[PDB]
Each structure stands twice: as C-alpha cells, then as structure tokens.
Amino acid sequence: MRKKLDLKKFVEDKNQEYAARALGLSQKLIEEVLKRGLPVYVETNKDGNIKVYITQDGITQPFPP
Numbered sequence: 001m002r003k004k005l006d007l008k009k010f011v012e013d014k015n016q017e018y019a020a021r022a023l024g025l026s027q028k029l030i031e032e033v034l035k036r037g038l039p040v041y042v043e044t045n046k047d048g049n050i051k052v053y054i055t056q057d058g059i060t061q062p063f064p065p
Contacts, residue, residue, distance in 0.1 A: 001043045001053060007034050010042075023052050025063040 007030070011019040016030045023030070023042060033040045039055035043062070051062030 001041065003043055003053075004039060004041045006037075007040045008037065022048070023050060023063065024065060025052060026065070029063070 007019065010022075011030070011034055013019070016027050016034070019034075020027050020030050025033075032038065033054060041053035041055075041060065042050050043053060044050035051064070053060040053062050
C-alpha cells in the first residue's frame with residue numbers, strides 16, 4: 001500500500017530474526033528479498049500483525065504463510 005522500504009534497513013535493526021518476526025515469511029525467503037533487494041512492502045495493522053506486499057511475478061502479494 002505505497003508503504004515500501006529498504007528491507008535491508010529493517011533487518012539491520014537486529015537481523016533477519018526481527019524482520020521475520022514482524023513480517024510473515026521464512027528466513028530464506030527474507031534472504032531472497034533482502035539480498036536480491038526486491039520491492040517489498042509492509043502494511044501493519046495494530047497489535048503487530050502486518051502484511052508483506054512484495055513485488056514478484058508482476059503482482060503484489062502480502063506474504064500470508
């Protein structure tokens with residue numbers, strides 16, 4: 001939702017654990033987005049639940065695994 005950010009900077013807060021803790025995806029996947037620097041978005045709700053509107057295959061899917 002227009003909320004895009006350098007996932008690297010987000011991970012840099014602690015590591016991939018925090019980024020994977022706040023977001024909804026595996027670590028390896030986080031690598032895919034982090035190392036490859038793909039267009040990743042995160043739309044938080046309130047209590048902490050957030051979606052990951054990432055850009056791959058030509059679609060913005062909110063990593064809901």
